[PDB]
């Protein structure tokens, strides 16, 4: 496999560790392409002593990422595959993961600022689903935030090209974000991603509270089966909670598509009366 965004190792300058990934750390760095202004980047690495299987799974994320060019999808700046160490280089995201950003900034943002963050996420998901992909890991922890509150879908490891994806495993899926049919049958569609989006909406409107709080994974599966749904967060507009309930419809076919979600949010942003009743 050849990567269009392959970069020479000399173009990257690795700085401090900013996180931990499945295969190795994520660093802050600087990318200097010839004749272009230097930029800040984030660098995903693969720990030394990796197996060939680990290298393949690591680079399969870069192959998926390299197919996307959207404002609300983490941008691939470069890939290092022909030199050592192997790296995935993306645009730097100052405010890190969405869930931890919101918890560290509880009550700092207005309803309209939060709706703007949600609109960006739904826009990135509309793009991904229309490219015929299922994410399967949509959670606030897998959304990155920049300095101007622009939210971007990241973490494409579980992503699959579709329309249903039927998985071979069950111990990899994050239960409290996963649609009941995807838990029961390992059947992932864009509609199961819509379910996850509804959970992300709840995470955002509650300033990063854990979905279903302390309830075990088993308790969550059981509650969803008995038609329980998460209550509206503190001071949440009724129209936004209604949209969450629409994303959580038992029948996947009754759920809105990402194109309808974007449209609903665009109308709310333009109609202040819609975000007024709680």
Curated annotation (Swiss-Prot):
What name does the UniProt record give this protein?
A: Ephrin type-B receptor 1
Where along this sequence does the record place binding of ATP?
A: 18-26, 44
- PTM annotation: Phosphorylated. Autophosphorylation is stimulated by the ligand EFNB1. Required for interaction with SH2 domain-containing interactors, for activation of the MAPK/ERK and JUN signaling cascades and for ubiquitination by CBL. Ubiquitinated; (EFNB1)ligand-induced poly- and/or multi-ubiquitination by CBL is regulated by SRC and leads to lysosomal degradation.
Q: Which residues lie on this side of the membrane: Cytoplasmic?
A: 1-278
Assembly, in brief, is: Heterotetramer upon binding of the ligand. The heterotetramer is composed of an ephrin dimer and a receptor dimer. Oligomerization is probably required to induce biological responses. Interacts with EPHB6; transphosphorylates EPHB6 to form an active signaling complex. Interacts with PICK1. The ligand-activated form interacts (residues within the catalytic domain) with GRB2 (via SH2 domain).
Give the Protein kinase domain ranges: 12-269
Q: Which family does it belong to?
A: Belongs to the protein kinase superfamily. Tyr protein kinase family. Ephrin receptor subfamily.
Residues annotated as catalytic: 137 (proton acceptor)
Which cysteine residues pair off into disulfide bonds? none
What are the top taxonomic ranks of the organism? Eukaryota, Metazoa, Chordata, Craniata, Vertebrata
**Source organism of the structure:** Homo sapiens
Q: In which tissues is it expressed?
A: Preferentially expressed in brain.
Protein function = Receptor tyrosine kinase which binds promiscuously transmembrane ephrin-B family ligands residing on adjacent cells, leading to contact-dependent bidirectional signaling into neighboring cells. The signaling pathway downstream of the receptor is referred to as forward signaling while the signaling pathway downstream of the ephrin ligand is referred to as reverse signaling. Cognate/functional ephrin ligands for this receptor include EFNB1, EFNB2 and EFNB3.
Q: Where in the cell is it found?
A: Cell membrane; Early endosome membrane; Cell projection, Dendrite
């Amino acid at each position: 496999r050849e990567f269009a965004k392959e970069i020479d190792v000399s173009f990257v300058k690795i700085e401090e560790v900013i996180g931990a990934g499945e295969f190795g750390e994520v660093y802050k760095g600087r990318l200097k392409l010839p004749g272009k202004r230097e930029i800040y980047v984030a660098i995903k690495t693969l720990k030394a002593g990796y197996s060939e299987k680990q290298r393949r799974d690591f680079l399969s994320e870069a192959s998926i990422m390299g197919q996307f060019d959207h404002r609300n999808i983490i941008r691939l700046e470069g890939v290092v595959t022909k030199s050592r160490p192997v790296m995935i280089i993306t645009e730097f995201m100052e405010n890190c993961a969405l869930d931890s950003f919101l918890r560290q900034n509880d009550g700092q943002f207005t309803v309209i600022q939060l709706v703007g963050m949600l609109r960006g996420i739904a826009a990135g998901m509309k793009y991904l689903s229309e490219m015929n992909y299922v994410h399967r890991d949509l959670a606030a922890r897998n959304i990155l935030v920049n300095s101007n509150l622009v939210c971007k879908v990241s973490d494409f490891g579980l992503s699959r090209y579709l329309p249903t994806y039927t998985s071979s495993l069950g111990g990899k899926i994050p239960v409290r974000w996963t649609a009941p049919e995807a838990i029961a049958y390992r059947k992932f569609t864009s509609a199961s991603d819509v379910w996850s989006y509804g959970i992300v909406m709840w995470e955002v409107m509650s300033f990063g509270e854990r979905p279903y709080w302390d309830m075990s994974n088993q308790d969550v599966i059981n509650a969803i089966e008995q038609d329980y749904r998460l209550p509206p967060p503190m001071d949440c507009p009724a129209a936004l909670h209604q949209l969450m309930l629409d994303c959580w419809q038992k029948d996947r076919n009754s759920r809105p598509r990402f194109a309808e979600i974007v449209n609903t949010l665009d109308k709310m942003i333009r109609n202040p009366a819609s975000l007024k009743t709680v």
